[PDB]
């Protein structure tokens, strides 16, 4: 069957709200505890951080929200990564 599949999630939801709570840069400790668990732990090098929600609900809709920041210091960033479904 390529007709249907039970619905698919990779959660820890969020919104541009707590995003607005956040901005470019503040100590990797503070934000680290602020927006939640670091979803994709960069292994090596670039403190590249990946707030991505993924949603595939049954053959009509989607949400691939992807986020990445860089904290190579006291927690300093200049990193833009947000995008809806893709």
């Amino acid at each position: 069957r390529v007709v249907y599949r039970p619905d698919i999630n990779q959660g820890n939801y969020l919104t541009a709200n707590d995003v607005s709570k956040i901005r470019v840069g503040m100590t990797q400790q503070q934000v680290a505890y602020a927006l939640g668990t670091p979803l994709m732990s960069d292994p090596f090098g670039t403190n590249t951080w990946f707030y991505v929600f993924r949603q595939q609900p049954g053959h009509e809709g989607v949400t691939q929200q992807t986020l990445t920041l860089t904290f190579n210091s006291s927690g300093v960033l200049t990193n833009i990564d947000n995008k809806p479904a893709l």
């Binding site: 069957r1 999630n9 820890n12 939640g36 668990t37």
Partner: protein, 782 residues
């Protein structure tokens, strides 16, 4: 200055060892200080008490009483009391096996038993604890226990009570006065905590009722000196009911407000009684828990106005522990693979609190019944106030299966009834079921195979592969032989997890050679148009049948080893597409239900029933082997196994390609040579079977024992009527067109599911049948 003297008889802590144990170290200026030191320390050590200062010349010479140490406790007297609480109260008393014996501690265990009786309730302090120092090192302790006393507690002293009838309250309680002759449901007995629980019983009772000033204040215990007529008195302080017309709330839950508003959607008339909104609070509670929290602090604080009887309730509402996510773990996985159990799980990392997830995993386990400590441990994973570890216990037993029957063929090739089940073969990710009844000339071979997954969407690798060369041989095989051979294999995408109408492939052909000489057989072949014979058992049929069938299955069951909440449902229906010899419309129906009639559940009523009918090609009689046999076996017992309904009448035949002489009872070479009354029950085309039984603990066994042992009692009822039947020829013999073959019989059934032996001992005493049913008396099942 001493020589650490000679002892014609020293044994214990010794010349030197005792030399130093007491203030009598060789080389000492000793004063009477040391003498009293010896004396007292001798008492003191708790290893030795024969205490003296007996100096020859001035050399200490002694008759000893050597008793180290405590050696033979004798828990004398244990009526319903076990020796273990005696032992544990013993170390509680400060001495034990392996303890230094200070004869001081004695009375303690007296008390240690005496007071012990209180915690039970019933108290008969008779504590005969006597010690015998056996004079080398041995000690024999006689621990004689007399406690004649019971907690038979009936003081329904219920007072302060003028709102709910005392008797109503009693009914709330666990102290009644009559043993029903219809069902065991009554209570009369004690414990401190039964007390408290009943306190809450009536309490919750009231406050639930909407009480808001109710409390209890009287607790006056009394027992007669005879220690049995137990009267204890209690009084309360009632509350005030209300009518509700006022509401307040405060939320810091991040965004679920008017969903509450209209989630309740009350209108201006509704009454106060509190537990209603307690379930409103559970509403909004799990509402948020699903939304993505775990521990908000949310309370509904009420008020008390009667000065207008005007009450308004307030609620504080936090947001909670949104996102604590850590991997899942297992413990108790020891022969099962991680991966298969993970195939069980449906959980997903990277979300927020879902009860449905973990508790369904619980239940999915419960379904398995090979292994059980269903334990979802989901504590905060330490540190990073950001996550929660997930971990899982299970307790296992070596569980494996084989069924067969006693004999016969040990005089012959080791004969096999081999149905064997690893059930760790699903430990291969897929389980195969195998039984062949490889009987001397009955070569039954089957194949059942299921991986629950071709694909995880639910499609399960389920296949059924068939052959039997059946000969039915005692003195010949040309009475009949079958190359019989068919496979049915499922295909279904079960989208709902309880809806399945599916489309697997169902085929058989069989080679049917030299069949039997019985009247039904003849007319059935006549019905096939293949008019049969008159004196042999030699004929032909090659059966090739083509299936279009749908069927639906619905089962909710808790425990895999042994359910309690039993609702299992299985239905099959076959519309047979042409090129089949018979285009049969076959309907087969079976259900089973546990109703655990109690919440301790030790009491479960079981009802099981089944329908089987064939309506297909109105235009053929039926290809027979789709027959029904039932009864006298396990679903019924006391009778011949699977023998019911329509009989089997032979027709005058003189060969089978040699049916042997001195043959079937009649209508052949034995007895009558003509048609006769050859009554050998085989049933008709509509079968109905049902057991009506109850299941109850024999508590005379350990909790482990009953955990493995099940005791029940059955009424085993079946009838099978052949929808297609005659009276014209049966102008003298019995017939079948509606349920009349109903019987009676009841039995005791006992099964121990020991890991190496699942054990069936039954005494079903047969107390009704009909014609063609034979008696069954003693045999011990699988």
């Amino acid at each position: 200055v001493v020589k650490d003297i000679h002892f014609e008889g020293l044994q214990r802590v010794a010349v030197g060892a005792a030399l130093l144990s007491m203030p009598v170290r060789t080389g000492d200026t000793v004063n009477d200080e040391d003498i009293s030191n010896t004396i007292r320390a001798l008492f003191a050590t708790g290893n030795f008490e024969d205490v003296r200062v007996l100096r020859d010349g001035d050399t200490l010479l002694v008759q000893v009483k050597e008793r180290p140490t405590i050696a033979s406790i004798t828990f004398s007297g244990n009526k319903s009391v076990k020796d273990d609480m005696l032992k544990q109260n013993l170390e509680a008393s400060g001495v034990r096996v392996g303890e230094s014996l200070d004869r001081t501690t004695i009375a303690d265990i007296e008390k240690g038993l005496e007071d012990f009786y209180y915690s039970v309730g019933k108290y008969s302090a008779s504590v005969k604890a006597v010690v015998t120092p056996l004079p080398r090192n041995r000690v024999d302790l006689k621990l004689v226990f007399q406690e004649g006393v019971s907690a038979e507690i009936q003081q329904i002293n219920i007072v302060g009570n003028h709102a709910f009838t005392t008797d109503e309250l009693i009914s709330h309680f666990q102290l009644r006065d009559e043993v029903p002759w219809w069902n065991v449901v009554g209570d009369r007995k004690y414990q401190k905590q039964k007390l408290a629980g009943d306190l809450e019983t009536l309490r919750s009772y009231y406050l639930d009722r909407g009480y808001a000033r109710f409390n209890i204040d009287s607790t006056q215990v009394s027992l007669t000196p005879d220690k049995k007529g137990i009267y204890v008195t209690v009084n309360i302080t009632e509350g005030d009911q209300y009518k509700l017309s006022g509401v307040e709330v405060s939320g810091n839950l991040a965004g679920h407000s008017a969903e509450i508003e209209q989630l309740t959607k009350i209108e201006p008339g509704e009454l106060y009684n509190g537990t209603k909104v307690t379930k409103m609070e559970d509403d909004i509670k799990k509402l948020l828990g699903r939304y993505g929290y775990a521990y908000p602090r949310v309370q509904s604080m009420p008020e008390i106005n009667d000065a207008d009887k005007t009450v308004k309730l307030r609620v504080n509402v936090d947001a909670g522990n949104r996102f604590y996510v850590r991997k899942i773990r297992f413990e108790g996985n020891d022969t099962s693979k991680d991966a298969v159990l993970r195939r069980e799980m449906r959980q997903m990392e990277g979300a927020w609190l879902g009860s449905d997830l973990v508790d369904q995993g619980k239940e999915r386990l419960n379904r398995l019944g090979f292994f059980e400590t269903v334990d979802t441990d989901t504590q905060r994973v330490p540190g990073s106030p950001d996550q929660v570890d997930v971990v899982y216990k299970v307790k296992e037993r070596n569980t494996g299966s084989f069924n067969f029957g006693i004999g016969y063929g040990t005089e012959s090739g080791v004969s096999f009834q081999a149905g064997v089940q690893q059930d760790n073969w699903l430990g291969t990710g897929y389980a195969v079921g195998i039984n062949g009844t490889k009987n001397d000339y009955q070569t039954y071979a089957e194949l059942s195979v299921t991986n629950p997954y071709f694909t995880v969407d639910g499609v399960s690798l389920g296949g059924r592969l068939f052959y039997n060369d059946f000969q039915a041989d005692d003195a010949d095989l040309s009475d009949y032989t079958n190359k019989s051979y068919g496979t049915d294999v499922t295909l279904g995408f079960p989208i709902n997890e309880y809806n399945s109408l599916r489309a697997g492939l169902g085929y058989v052909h069989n080679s049917l050679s030299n069949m039997q000489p019985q009247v039904a057989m003849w007319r059935y072949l006549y019905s096939m148009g293949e008019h049969p014979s008159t004196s042999d058992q030699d004929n032909s049929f090659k059966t090739d049948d083509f299936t279009f069938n749908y069927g639906w299955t619905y089962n909710k069951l808790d425990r895999g080893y042994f359910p309690t909440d039993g609702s299992r449902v299985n239905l099959t229906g076959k519309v047979t597409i042409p090129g089949s010899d018979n285009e049969y419309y076959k309907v087969t129906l079976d259900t089973a239900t546990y109703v655990p009639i109690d919440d301790d559940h030790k009491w479960v009523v079981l009802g099981r029933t089944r329908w089987g009918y064939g309506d297909g090609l109105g235009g053929k009689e039926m290809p027979f082997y789709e027959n029904f046999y039932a009864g006298g076996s396990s679903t019924v017992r006391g009778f011949q196994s699977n023998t019911i309904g329509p009989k089997a009448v032979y027709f005058p035949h003189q060969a089978s390609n040699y049916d042997p002489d001195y043959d079937y009872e009649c209508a052949t070479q034995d007895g009558a040579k003509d048609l006769c009354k050859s009554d050998d029950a085989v049933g008709g085309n509509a079968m109905a079977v049902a057991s009506l039984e109850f299941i109850t603990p024999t508590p005379f066994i350990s909790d482990k024992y009953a955990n493995s042992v099940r005791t029940s009692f059955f009424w085993d009822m079946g009838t099978v009527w052949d929808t297609n039947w005659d009276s014209s020829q049966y102008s003298g013999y019995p017939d079948y067109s509606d349920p009349s073959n109903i019987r009676m019989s009841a039995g005791i059934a006992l099964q121990w599911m020991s890991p190496l032996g699942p054990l069936v001992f039954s005494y079903a005493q047969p107390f009704k049948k009909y014609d063609g049913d034979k008696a069954e008396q003693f045999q011990f099942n699988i």
